[PDB]
Structure 1
Amino acid sequence: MDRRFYGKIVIKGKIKAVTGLHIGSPVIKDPHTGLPYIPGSSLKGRLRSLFEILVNSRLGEWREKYPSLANYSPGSCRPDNQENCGKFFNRKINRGWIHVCPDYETALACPVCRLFGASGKESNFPSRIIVRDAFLTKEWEEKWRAGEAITEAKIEVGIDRVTSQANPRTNERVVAGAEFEFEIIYNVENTTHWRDDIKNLLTAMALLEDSYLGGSGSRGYGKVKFIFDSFEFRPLDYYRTGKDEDIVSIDAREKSVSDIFDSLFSEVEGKL
Protein backbone atom coordinates (compact mmCIF):
# COMPACT_ATOMS: atom_id res chain seq x y z
CA MET A 1 0.00 0.00 0.00
CA ASP A 2 1.31 3.39 -1.25
CA ARG A 3 5.06 3.70 -1.86
CA ARG A 4 5.89 7.28 -2.81
CA PHE A 5 9.13 9.10 -3.59
CA TYR A 6 10.13 12.69 -2.91
CA GLY A 7 13.90 12.54 -3.10
CA LYS A 8 17.03 11.01 -1.65
CA ILE A 9 19.16 12.46 1.16
CA VAL A 10 22.78 11.51 0.44
CA ILE A 11 25.38 11.36 3.22
CA LYS A 12 29.01 11.43 2.15
CA GLY A 13 32.23 11.57 4.08
CA LYS A 14 35.07 9.48 5.44
CA ILE A 15 35.49 6.65 7.92
CA LYS A 16 38.63 7.05 10.00
CA ALA A 17 40.12 3.87 11.39
CA VAL A 18 41.25 5.54 14.60
CA THR A 19 42.57 2.22 15.80
CA GLY A 20 43.17 -0.86 13.67
CA LEU A 21 40.24 -2.30 11.82
CA HIS A 22 39.57 -5.99 11.39
CA ILE A 23 36.85 -7.33 9.11
CA GLY A 24 37.74 -10.93 8.44
CA SER A 25 37.57 -12.99 5.29
CA PRO A 26 42.97 -11.86 6.71
CA VAL A 27 41.08 -8.59 6.18
CA ILE A 28 38.77 -8.54 3.16
CA LYS A 29 40.19 -7.01 0.00
CA ASP A 30 38.44 -6.39 -3.28
CA PRO A 31 39.84 -8.66 -5.99
CA HIS A 32 40.69 -5.95 -8.51
CA THR A 33 42.50 -3.08 -6.80
CA GLY A 34 43.74 -5.34 -4.01
CA LEU A 35 43.27 -2.74 -1.28
CA PRO A 36 41.09 -3.52 1.76
CA TYR A 37 37.61 -2.10 2.11
CA ILE A 38 34.55 -1.92 4.33
CA PRO A 39 31.40 -3.52 2.95
CA GLY A 40 28.00 -2.04 3.35
CA SER A 41 26.76 -5.27 4.78
CA SER A 42 29.25 -5.02 7.62
CA LEU A 43 28.17 -1.44 8.31
CA LYS A 44 24.38 -1.63 7.91
CA GLY A 45 24.38 -4.72 10.06
CA ARG A 46 26.21 -2.81 12.80
CA LEU A 47 24.17 0.36 12.71
CA ARG A 48 21.15 -1.95 12.88
CA SER A 49 22.42 -4.24 15.66
CA LEU A 50 22.94 -1.17 17.87
CA PHE A 51 19.68 0.57 17.15
CA GLU A 52 17.98 -2.79 17.87
CA ILE A 53 19.18 -2.81 21.46
CA LEU A 54 18.49 0.92 21.72
CA VAL A 55 14.85 0.19 20.86
CA ASN A 56 14.74 -2.94 23.05
CA SER A 57 15.66 -0.85 26.07
CA ARG A 58 13.07 1.86 25.32
CA LEU A 59 10.49 -0.64 24.07
CA GLY A 60 7.67 0.54 26.29
CA GLU A 61 8.44 4.23 26.26
CA TRP A 62 7.78 4.78 22.56
CA ARG A 63 4.61 2.84 21.69
CA GLU A 64 2.52 6.02 21.43
CA LYS A 65 5.05 7.50 18.96
CA TYR A 66 5.93 4.24 17.19
CA PRO A 67 2.96 1.85 17.21
CA SER A 68 3.58 -1.88 16.75
CA LEU A 69 6.12 -1.62 19.54
CA ALA A 70 3.17 -2.38 21.79
CA ASN A 71 3.15 -5.90 20.37
CA TYR A 72 6.58 -6.74 21.82
CA SER A 73 8.02 -7.17 25.29
CA PRO A 74 11.78 -7.25 25.81
CA GLY A 75 14.07 -10.20 25.31
CA SER A 76 14.80 -13.01 22.88
CA CYS A 77 12.67 -15.86 21.59
CA ARG A 78 15.33 -18.40 22.50
CA PRO A 79 13.83 -19.55 25.88
CA ASP A 80 10.63 -20.46 23.97
CA ASN A 81 11.50 -21.44 20.40
CA GLN A 82 8.67 -19.79 18.51
CA GLU A 83 8.80 -17.30 15.68
CA ASN A 84 6.38 -14.50 16.50
CA CYS A 85 5.36 -14.20 20.15
CA GLY A 86 5.57 -11.42 22.70
CA LYS A 87 9.36 -11.15 22.51
CA PHE A 88 11.18 -8.52 20.48
CA PHE A 89 13.91 -10.63 18.89
CA ASN A 90 11.54 -12.66 16.77
CA ARG A 91 13.39 -14.21 13.80
CA LYS A 92 15.59 -17.24 13.73
CA ILE A 93 18.28 -16.90 11.09
CA ASN A 94 20.16 -20.18 11.38
CA ARG A 95 20.30 -20.71 15.15
CA GLY A 96 20.28 -17.08 16.30
CA TRP A 97 17.71 -14.43 17.05
CA ILE A 98 17.15 -11.06 15.35
CA HIS A 99 14.28 -8.56 15.30
CA VAL A 100 12.54 -8.38 11.93
CA CYS A 101 8.86 -7.48 11.85
CA PRO A 102 6.77 -10.05 9.88
CA ASP A 103 4.49 -7.82 7.82
CA TYR A 104 4.20 -4.57 5.88
CA GLU A 105 1.74 -2.74 8.08
CA THR A 106 3.44 -3.88 11.26
CA ALA A 107 6.91 -2.84 10.06
CA LEU A 108 5.75 0.49 8.66
CA ALA A 109 5.41 1.62 12.28
CA CYS A 110 8.46 -0.11 13.68
CA PRO A 111 11.28 2.42 14.06
CA VAL A 112 13.93 -0.15 13.24
CA CYS A 113 12.12 -1.63 10.28
CA ARG A 114 10.94 1.50 8.53
CA LEU A 115 14.64 2.45 8.20
CA PHE A 116 16.53 -0.84 7.83
CA GLY A 117 13.71 -2.77 6.20
CA ALA A 118 12.21 -6.13 6.87
CA SER A 119 11.04 -9.33 5.27
CA GLY A 120 8.43 -11.93 5.95
CA LYS A 121 5.74 -14.37 4.78
CA GLU A 122 2.82 -12.89 2.66
CA SER A 123 4.07 -9.27 3.23
CA ASN A 124 7.46 -7.53 2.88
CA PHE A 125 8.88 -4.12 3.79
CA PRO A 126 12.02 -3.04 1.86
CA SER A 127 14.61 -0.67 3.24
CA ARG A 128 14.95 3.06 3.00
CA ILE A 129 18.72 3.34 3.38
CA ILE A 130 21.36 2.15 0.95
CA VAL A 131 24.73 1.61 2.55
CA ARG A 132 27.39 1.37 -0.13
CA ASP A 133 30.80 -0.24 0.13
CA ALA A 134 33.57 1.98 1.43
CA PHE A 135 36.83 1.87 -0.51
CA LEU A 136 40.04 3.70 0.37
CA THR A 137 40.18 7.42 -0.32
CA LYS A 138 42.14 9.24 -3.01
CA GLU A 139 45.00 9.92 -0.58
CA TRP A 140 45.40 6.30 0.42
CA GLU A 141 45.31 4.84 -3.08
CA GLU A 142 48.50 6.85 -3.53
CA LYS A 143 49.94 6.14 -0.08
CA TRP A 144 49.61 2.56 -1.28
CA ARG A 145 51.21 3.63 -4.58
CA ALA A 146 54.08 5.33 -2.76
CA GLY A 147 55.02 2.06 -1.05
CA GLU A 148 53.54 2.27 2.45
CA ALA A 149 52.04 -0.61 4.38
CA ILE A 150 48.26 -0.52 4.26
CA THR A 151 47.79 -3.51 6.59
CA GLU A 152 49.79 -5.05 9.43
CA ALA A 153 50.26 -8.48 10.94
CA LYS A 154 49.78 -8.25 14.69
CA ILE A 155 50.90 -11.11 16.91
CA GLU A 156 48.97 -11.93 20.08
CA VAL A 157 49.33 -14.71 22.62
CA GLY A 158 47.35 -16.64 25.22
CA ILE A 159 48.84 -17.18 28.67
CA ASP A 160 48.05 -20.12 30.94
CA ARG A 161 46.92 -18.80 34.30
CA VAL A 162 48.97 -21.23 36.40
CA THR A 163 52.31 -21.87 34.68
CA SER A 164 52.45 -18.83 32.31
CA GLN A 165 52.51 -21.06 29.25
CA ALA A 166 51.83 -18.79 26.30
CA ASN A 167 50.21 -19.63 22.96
CA PRO A 168 50.62 -17.19 20.06
CA ARG A 169 48.52 -16.41 17.02
CA THR A 170 48.60 -13.85 14.23
CA ASN A 171 45.86 -11.42 13.26
CA GLU A 172 46.02 -9.30 10.15
CA ARG A 173 44.46 -5.85 10.45
CA VAL A 174 44.23 -2.53 8.63
CA VAL A 175 46.75 -0.03 9.95
CA ALA A 176 45.52 2.78 12.19
CA GLY A 177 44.61 6.09 10.64
CA ALA A 178 43.49 4.47 7.37
CA GLU A 179 40.58 6.27 5.87
CA PHE A 180 37.75 4.82 3.78
CA GLU A 181 35.16 6.74 1.77
CA PHE A 182 31.52 5.87 2.40
CA GLU A 183 28.04 6.88 1.27
CA ILE A 184 24.59 6.41 2.84
CA ILE A 185 21.37 7.10 0.94
CA TYR A 186 18.09 7.66 2.73
CA ASN A 187 15.20 7.38 0.29
CA VAL A 188 12.49 9.82 1.28
CA GLU A 189 9.38 7.71 0.86
CA ASN A 190 7.26 9.88 3.15
CA THR A 191 7.49 13.55 4.07
CA THR A 192 5.87 12.99 7.44
CA HIS A 193 8.69 10.91 8.91
CA TRP A 194 12.07 11.68 7.44
CA ARG A 195 13.27 13.66 10.45
CA ASP A 196 12.75 10.64 12.66
CA ASP A 197 14.59 8.35 10.27
CA ILE A 198 17.54 10.68 9.77
CA LYS A 199 17.66 11.15 13.55
CA ASN A 200 17.56 7.42 14.22
CA LEU A 201 20.29 6.89 11.67
CA LEU A 202 22.34 9.47 13.52
CA THR A 203 21.63 7.67 16.81
CA ALA A 204 22.99 4.49 15.23
CA MET A 205 26.03 6.40 13.93
CA ALA A 206 26.74 7.80 17.40
CA LEU A 207 26.43 4.40 19.07
CA LEU A 208 28.79 2.98 16.44
CA GLU A 209 31.19 5.83 17.09
CA ASP A 210 31.42 4.81 20.76
CA SER A 211 31.56 1.07 19.99
CA TYR A 212 33.77 -0.77 17.49
CA LEU A 213 33.30 -2.03 13.92
CA GLY A 214 34.13 -5.63 13.13
CA GLY A 215 36.96 -7.70 14.51
CA SER A 216 37.77 -8.25 18.17
CA GLY A 217 36.77 -4.79 19.27
CA SER A 218 36.73 -5.52 22.97
CA ARG A 219 40.51 -5.79 22.55
CA GLY A 220 40.89 -2.54 20.57
CA TYR A 221 40.30 -3.53 16.93
CA GLY A 222 37.58 -1.05 16.11
CA LYS A 223 37.11 2.63 16.80
CA VAL A 224 35.71 4.16 13.69
CA LYS A 225 35.22 7.93 13.41
CA PHE A 226 32.85 9.64 10.95
CA ILE A 227 34.33 12.67 9.20
CA PHE A 228 31.42 14.31 7.43
CA ASP A 229 31.57 15.95 4.03
CA SER A 230 28.08 16.62 2.64
CA PHE A 231 24.45 16.08 3.36
CA GLU A 232 22.65 16.62 0.09
CA PHE A 233 19.02 16.42 -0.80
CA ARG A 234 18.58 15.65 -4.58
CA PRO A 235 14.84 16.30 -4.86
CA LEU A 236 12.30 14.83 -7.27
CA ASP A 237 13.09 17.49 -9.88
CA TYR A 238 16.87 17.06 -9.79
CA TYR A 239 16.42 13.79 -11.61
CA ARG A 240 14.27 15.17 -14.42
CA THR A 241 15.95 18.44 -15.29
CA GLY A 242 19.46 17.40 -14.34
CA LYS A 243 20.33 20.91 -13.15
CA ASP A 244 22.03 21.46 -9.81
CA GLU A 245 18.84 22.01 -7.82
CA ASP A 246 19.92 20.03 -4.78
CA ILE A 247 20.13 21.47 -1.27
CA VAL A 248 23.41 20.93 0.58
CA SER A 249 23.92 21.13 4.35
CA ILE A 250 27.23 22.79 5.27
CA ASP A 251 28.87 20.42 7.74
CA ALA A 252 32.40 19.79 6.51
CA ARG A 253 33.90 20.10 10.01
CA GLU A 254 31.27 18.67 12.37
CA LYS A 255 30.65 15.64 14.56
CA SER A 256 27.99 12.95 14.25
CA VAL A 257 26.61 14.24 17.57
CA SER A 258 26.80 17.83 16.34
CA ASP A 259 24.34 17.21 13.52
CA ILE A 260 21.89 16.05 16.13
CA PHE A 261 19.51 19.63 13.78
CA ASP A 262 16.84 22.18 13.02
CA SER A 263 19.40 24.74 11.89
CA LEU A 264 21.02 22.44 9.35
CA PHE A 265 18.00 20.97 7.60
CA SER A 266 15.86 24.09 7.23
CA GLU A 267 15.91 24.28 3.42
CA VAL A 268 15.08 20.57 3.22
CA GLU A 269 12.09 21.37 5.46
CA GLY A 270 11.00 24.24 3.23
CA LYS A 271 11.43 22.14 0.11
CA LEU A 272 9.15 19.52 1.79
Structure 2
Amino acid sequence: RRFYGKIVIKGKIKAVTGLHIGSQANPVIKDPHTGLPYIPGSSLKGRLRSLFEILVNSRLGEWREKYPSLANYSPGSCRPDNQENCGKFFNRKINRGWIHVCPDYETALACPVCRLFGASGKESNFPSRIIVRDAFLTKEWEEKWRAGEAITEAKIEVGIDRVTSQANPRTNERVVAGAEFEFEIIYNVENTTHWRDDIKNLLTAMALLEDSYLGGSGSRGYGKVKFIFDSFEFRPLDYYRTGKDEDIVSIDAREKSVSDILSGFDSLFSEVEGKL
Protein backbone atom coordinates (compact mmCIF):
# COMPACT_ATOMS: atom_id res chain seq x y z
CA ARG A 1 0.00 0.00 0.00
CA ARG A 2 2.36 2.77 -1.30
CA PHE A 3 5.25 1.59 0.95
CA TYR A 4 8.14 4.14 0.71
CA GLY A 5 10.58 3.44 3.57
CA LYS A 6 10.85 2.43 7.26
CA ILE A 7 12.29 4.86 9.88
CA VAL A 8 14.01 2.97 12.76
CA ILE A 9 14.64 4.71 16.14
CA LYS A 10 17.07 2.95 18.54
CA GLY A 11 17.71 4.28 22.08
CA LYS A 12 18.13 3.11 25.68
CA ILE A 13 15.23 3.14 28.15
CA LYS A 14 16.69 3.80 31.60
CA ALA A 15 14.99 3.18 34.94
CA VAL A 16 15.87 6.11 37.19
CA THR A 17 13.47 4.73 39.77
CA GLY A 18 12.49 1.11 40.18
CA LEU A 19 10.34 -0.11 37.27
CA HIS A 20 7.50 -2.59 37.93
CA ILE A 21 5.40 -4.16 35.18
CA GLY A 22 3.46 -6.97 36.78
CA SER A 23 2.30 -10.50 35.86
CA GLN A 24 -0.07 -11.95 38.44
CA ALA A 25 5.36 -11.95 45.77
CA ASN A 26 4.18 -9.60 43.02
CA PRO A 27 6.39 -10.44 40.07
CA VAL A 28 7.51 -8.17 37.31
CA ILE A 29 7.33 -10.05 34.00
CA LYS A 30 10.33 -12.15 33.04
CA ASP A 31 11.65 -14.18 30.15
CA PRO A 32 10.74 -17.84 30.76
CA HIS A 33 14.27 -19.02 29.96
CA THR A 34 16.81 -16.39 31.15
CA GLY A 35 14.45 -15.15 33.93
CA LEU A 36 15.68 -11.54 33.43
CA PRO A 37 13.00 -8.81 33.37
CA TYR A 38 11.92 -6.99 30.23
CA ILE A 39 9.64 -4.20 29.10
CA PRO A 40 6.97 -5.41 26.65
CA GLY A 41 6.01 -3.79 23.45
CA SER A 42 2.35 -3.90 24.22
CA SER A 43 3.08 -2.03 27.42
CA LEU A 44 5.23 0.63 25.92
CA LYS A 45 3.12 1.22 22.80
CA GLY A 46 -0.06 1.55 24.77
CA ARG A 47 1.39 3.91 27.30
CA LEU A 48 2.43 6.20 24.47
CA ARG A 49 -1.00 5.87 22.78
CA SER A 50 -2.77 6.59 26.10
CA LEU A 51 -0.82 9.73 26.95
CA PHE A 52 -1.28 11.03 23.44
CA GLU A 53 -5.03 10.52 23.22
CA ILE A 54 -5.33 12.60 26.38
CA LEU A 55 -3.12 15.12 24.50
CA VAL A 56 -5.42 15.28 21.40
CA ASN A 57 -8.59 15.33 23.50
CA SER A 58 -7.61 18.68 24.95
CA ARG A 59 -6.92 20.02 21.45
CA LEU A 60 -9.99 19.10 19.41
CA GLY A 61 -10.38 22.74 18.43
CA GLU A 62 -6.95 23.93 17.38
CA TRP A 63 -6.23 20.88 15.25
CA ARG A 64 -9.28 20.82 13.02
CA GLU A 65 -7.43 22.20 10.01
CA LYS A 66 -4.12 20.33 10.27
CA TYR A 67 -6.02 17.11 11.00
CA PRO A 68 -9.39 16.44 9.26
CA SER A 69 -12.15 14.32 11.01
CA LEU A 70 -11.24 15.85 14.43
CA ALA A 71 -14.34 18.12 14.07
CA ASN A 72 -16.63 15.06 14.54
CA TYR A 73 -15.71 14.63 18.23
CA SER A 74 -16.47 16.68 21.29
CA PRO A 75 -13.98 16.15 24.12
CA GLY A 76 -14.97 13.37 26.47
CA SER A 77 -15.84 9.74 26.94
CA CYS A 78 -18.91 8.07 25.40
CA ARG A 79 -19.20 6.06 28.69
CA PRO A 80 -22.35 7.95 29.82
CA ASP A 81 -24.30 6.82 26.70
CA ASN A 82 -23.68 3.10 26.05
CA GLN A 83 -23.44 3.64 22.32
CA GLU A 84 -20.20 3.55 20.40
CA ASN A 85 -19.39 6.22 17.73
CA CYS A 86 -21.39 8.95 19.41
CA GLY A 87 -20.14 12.50 19.18
CA LYS A 88 -17.38 12.14 21.76
CA PHE A 89 -13.69 11.42 21.33
CA PHE A 90 -13.40 8.20 23.32
CA ASN A 91 -15.86 6.20 21.33
CA ARG A 92 -15.00 2.49 21.21
CA LYS A 93 -15.98 0.30 24.15
CA ILE A 94 -13.36 -2.42 24.09
CA ASN A 95 -14.71 -4.36 27.02
CA ARG A 96 -15.55 -1.88 29.77
CA GLY A 97 -13.03 0.82 28.97
CA TRP A 98 -13.64 3.45 26.31
CA ILE A 99 -10.76 4.16 23.91
CA HIS A 100 -10.49 6.42 20.90
CA VAL A 101 -10.40 4.10 17.92
CA CYS A 102 -11.62 5.71 14.68
CA PRO A 103 -14.52 3.99 12.94
CA ASP A 104 -13.43 3.83 9.34
CA TYR A 105 -10.29 3.89 7.17
CA GLU A 106 -11.12 7.23 5.60
CA THR A 107 -11.47 8.93 8.95
CA ALA A 108 -8.51 7.17 10.57
CA LEU A 109 -6.34 8.47 7.75
CA ALA A 110 -7.16 11.93 9.10
CA CYS A 111 -6.94 11.43 12.87
CA PRO A 112 -3.56 12.25 14.44
CA VAL A 113 -3.97 9.29 16.79
CA CYS A 114 -5.33 6.48 14.68
CA ARG A 115 -2.97 7.18 11.80
CA LEU A 116 0.03 6.30 13.90
CA PHE A 117 -1.27 3.61 16.27
CA GLY A 118 -3.92 2.28 13.80
CA ALA A 119 -7.69 1.60 14.20
CA SER A 120 -10.35 -1.16 13.67
CA GLY A 121 -13.92 -0.73 12.26
CA LYS A 122 -16.37 -2.49 9.90
CA GLU A 123 -15.72 -1.89 6.14
CA SER A 124 -11.90 -2.32 6.69
CA ASN A 125 -9.50 -0.90 9.32
CA PHE A 126 -6.18 1.04 9.51
CA PRO A 127 -3.08 -1.05 10.50
CA SER A 128 -0.66 0.72 12.84
CA ARG A 129 2.36 2.44 11.46
CA ILE A 130 4.71 1.70 14.32
CA ILE A 131 6.24 -1.44 15.75
CA VAL A 132 7.36 -1.07 19.34
CA ARG A 133 9.72 -3.92 20.06
CA ASP A 134 10.25 -5.47 23.46
CA ALA A 135 12.94 -3.74 25.48
CA PHE A 136 15.30 -6.31 26.96
CA LEU A 137 18.24 -5.55 29.23
CA THR A 138 21.45 -4.29 27.70
CA LYS A 139 24.51 -6.52 27.80
CA GLU A 140 26.09 -4.44 30.54
CA TRP A 141 23.27 -5.59 32.79
CA GLU A 142 23.27 -9.18 31.69
CA GLU A 143 26.90 -9.12 32.78
CA LYS A 144 25.90 -7.77 36.16
CA TRP A 145 23.36 -10.60 36.38
CA ARG A 146 26.12 -12.98 35.23
CA ALA A 147 28.41 -11.31 37.77
CA GLY A 148 26.03 -12.25 40.59
CA GLU A 149 24.51 -8.88 41.47
CA ALA A 150 20.83 -8.32 42.05
CA ILE A 151 18.63 -7.21 39.17
CA THR A 152 15.21 -7.00 40.88
CA GLU A 153 14.35 -6.04 44.42
CA ALA A 154 11.49 -6.80 46.79
CA LYS A 155 9.98 -3.63 48.19
CA ILE A 156 7.65 -3.65 51.17
CA GLU A 157 4.77 -1.13 51.33
CA VAL A 158 2.15 -0.85 54.12
CA GLY A 159 -1.29 0.67 54.35
CA ILE A 160 -2.19 2.42 57.61
CA ASP A 161 -5.47 3.18 59.35
CA ARG A 162 -5.34 6.86 60.08
CA VAL A 163 -7.09 6.79 63.45
CA THR A 164 -5.76 3.62 65.04
CA SER A 165 -2.37 3.34 63.24
CA GLN A 166 -2.90 -0.37 62.44
CA ALA A 167 -0.47 -1.57 59.69
CA ASN A 168 -1.28 -4.20 56.99
CA PRO A 169 1.89 -4.40 54.73
CA ARG A 170 2.19 -5.94 51.19
CA THR A 171 5.32 -6.47 49.01
CA ASN A 172 5.91 -5.43 45.38
CA GLU A 173 8.77 -6.74 43.34
CA ARG A 174 10.34 -4.09 41.18
CA VAL A 175 13.39 -3.94 38.92
CA VAL A 176 16.43 -2.29 40.52
CA ALA A 177 16.71 1.43 39.76
CA GLY A 178 19.49 2.12 37.29
CA ALA A 179 18.75 -0.73 34.87
CA GLU A 180 19.43 0.21 31.25
CA PHE A 181 17.18 -1.20 28.52
CA GLU A 182 17.28 -1.17 24.73
CA PHE A 183 14.28 -0.18 22.63
CA GLU A 184 13.56 -0.05 18.92
CA ILE A 185 10.64 1.64 17.19
CA ILE A 186 10.07 1.05 13.50
CA TYR A 187 7.81 3.62 11.83
CA ASN A 188 6.35 2.73 8.42
CA VAL A 189 6.40 5.51 5.84
CA GLU A 190 3.14 4.74 4.03
CA ASN A 191 2.65 8.33 2.99
CA THR A 192 5.30 10.90 2.32
CA THR A 193 3.21 13.97 3.13
CA HIS A 194 2.73 13.01 6.77
CA TRP A 195 5.86 11.40 8.02
CA ARG A 196 7.19 14.44 9.85
CA ASP A 197 3.97 14.86 11.77
CA ASP A 198 3.85 11.23 12.82
CA ILE A 199 7.42 11.47 14.08
CA LYS A 200 6.81 14.74 15.90
CA ASN A 201 3.75 13.17 17.48
CA LEU A 202 5.69 10.06 18.46
CA LEU A 203 8.28 12.26 20.13
CA THR A 204 5.62 14.38 21.80
CA ALA A 205 4.21 11.29 23.45
CA MET A 206 7.68 10.16 24.47
CA ALA A 207 8.19 13.49 26.19
CA LEU A 208 4.96 13.02 28.12
CA LEU A 209 6.23 9.64 29.28
CA GLU A 210 9.38 11.21 30.64
CA ASP A 211 7.28 13.22 33.09
CA SER A 212 4.62 10.56 33.53
CA TYR A 213 5.48 7.02 34.55
CA LEU A 214 5.79 3.73 32.71
CA GLY A 215 4.13 0.85 34.41
CA GLY A 216 3.06 -0.11 37.89
CA SER A 217 2.58 2.36 40.67
CA GLY A 218 4.08 5.58 39.48
CA SER A 219 1.92 7.87 41.53
CA ARG A 220 3.91 6.32 44.36
CA GLY A 221 7.18 6.49 42.41
CA TYR A 222 7.55 3.36 40.21
CA GLY A 223 7.92 5.12 36.81
CA LYS A 224 10.57 7.85 36.20
CA VAL A 225 11.84 6.08 33.00
CA LYS A 226 14.36 8.09 30.88
CA PHE A 227 14.77 7.82 27.05
CA ILE A 228 18.33 7.99 25.69
CA PHE A 229 18.61 7.79 21.95
CA ASP A 230 21.45 6.40 19.88
CA SER A 231 20.66 6.58 16.18
CA PHE A 232 17.72 7.06 13.79
CA GLU A 233 18.19 5.39 10.38
CA PHE A 234 15.67 5.74 7.52
CA ARG A 235 15.59 2.62 5.28
CA PRO A 236 14.65 3.58 1.68
CA LEU A 237 12.48 1.31 -0.54
CA ASP A 238 15.54 0.65 -2.80
CA TYR A 239 17.65 -0.49 0.23
CA TYR A 240 15.41 -3.59 0.72
CA ARG A 241 15.36 -4.18 -3.05
CA THR A 242 19.14 -4.57 -3.06
CA GLY A 243 20.40 -5.05 0.48
CA LYS A 244 23.06 -2.39 0.10
CA ASP A 245 23.82 -0.36 3.21
CA GLU A 246 22.75 2.90 1.58
CA ASP A 247 20.46 4.50 4.15
CA ILE A 248 20.35 7.84 5.95
CA VAL A 249 21.56 7.75 9.55
CA SER A 250 20.77 10.60 11.93
CA ILE A 251 23.36 10.18 14.68
CA ASP A 252 22.60 11.52 18.16
CA ALA A 253 24.23 9.53 20.91
CA ARG A 254 23.47 11.94 23.77
CA GLU A 255 20.21 13.81 23.19
CA LYS A 256 16.95 14.08 25.08
CA SER A 257 13.49 13.87 23.65
CA VAL A 258 13.07 17.67 23.97
CA SER A 259 16.54 18.25 22.41
CA ASP A 260 15.45 16.12 19.40
CA ILE A 261 11.70 16.99 19.18
CA LEU A 262 12.23 20.65 18.09
CA SER A 263 15.94 21.48 18.62
CA GLY A 264 17.13 19.10 15.85
CA PHE A 265 13.86 18.16 14.09
CA ASP A 266 14.76 20.07 10.93
CA SER A 267 18.54 20.11 11.50
CA LEU A 268 18.89 16.33 11.93
CA PHE A 269 16.06 15.09 9.68
CA SER A 270 17.05 17.37 6.79
CA GLU A 271 18.62 14.46 4.93
CA VAL A 272 15.49 12.37 5.49
CA GLU A 273 13.42 15.23 4.05
CA GLY A 274 15.54 15.09 0.91
CA LYS A 275 15.25 11.48 -0.19
CA LEU A 276 11.53 11.24 0.82
When normalised by structure 1's length, the TM-score is: 0.98
How far did 1:209 drift? 0.7
Deviations along 1:169-226, whole A, 9 cap, x unmatched? 0000000000111100000001100000000000000000110001010000011100
How far did 1:120 drift? 1.2
Aligned equivalents of 1:65, 1:234: Cα separation in 2: 27
How far did 1:81 drift? 1.0
How far did 1:58 drift? 0.4
Aligned equivalents of 2:170, 2:37: Cα separation in 1: 21
Deviations along 1:224-256, whole A, 9 cap, x unmatched? 100101100011111122111011112111111
When normalised by structure 2's length, the TM-score is: 0.97
Q: In the alignment, what sits opposite 2:157?
A: 156
1:9–1:188: 8 Å Cα contact kept in structure 2?
yes
Percent identity over the alignment is 100
Aligned equivalents of 1:139, 1:13: Cα separation in 2: 15
1:84–1:90: 8 Å Cα contact kept in structure 2?
yes
Partner of 2:188: helix, strand, or coil?
strand
Aligned equivalents of 2:33, 2:163: Cα separation in 1: 48
Whether 1:198 aligns to 2:202 is no
Aligned equivalents of 2:199, 2:67: Cα separation in 1: 15
1:247–1:267: 8 Å Cα contact kept in structure 2?
yes
Aligned equivalents of 2:7, 2:16: Cα separation in 1: 27
Q: In the alignment, what sits opposite 2:133?
A: 132
1:14–1:227: 8 Å Cα contact kept in structure 2?
yes
Deviations along 1:97-143, whole A, 9 cap, x unmatched? 10000110010000000000011112200000000101100101111
1:102–1:123: 8 Å Cα contact kept in structure 2?
no
Aligned equivalents of 2:247, 2:53: Cα separation in 1: 32
1:234–1:246: 8 Å Cα contact kept in structure 2?
yes
1:89–1:100: 8 Å Cα contact kept in structure 2?
yes
How far did 1:93 drift? 1.1
How far did 1:60 drift? 1.2
Partner of 2:260: helix, strand, or coil?
coil
How far did 1:270 drift? 0.8
How far did 1:6 drift? 0.9
Runs ≥4 residues deviating over 6 A: none
1:37–1:135: 8 Å Cα contact kept in structure 2?
yes
Whether 1:265 aligns to 2:262 is no
Aligned equivalents of 2:244, 2:89: Cα separation in 1: 46
Deviations along 1:151-173, whole A, 9 cap, x unmatched? 00000101101011111000000
Aligned equivalents of 1:165, 1:105: Cα separation in 2: 58
Structure 1's unaligned 5+ residue stretches are none
Aligned equivalents of 1:155, 1:54: Cα separation in 2: 34
Aligned equivalents of 2:124, 2:5: Cα separation in 1: 25
1:19–1:224: 8 Å Cα contact kept in structure 2?
yes
Aligned equivalents of 2:242, 2:92: Cα separation in 1: 44
Aligned equivalents of 1:188, 1:53: Cα separation in 2: 25
Aligned equivalents of 2:94, 2:227: Cα separation in 1: 30
Aligned equivalents of 1:231, 1:107: Cα separation in 2: 26
1:4 to 2, 5, 21: 2
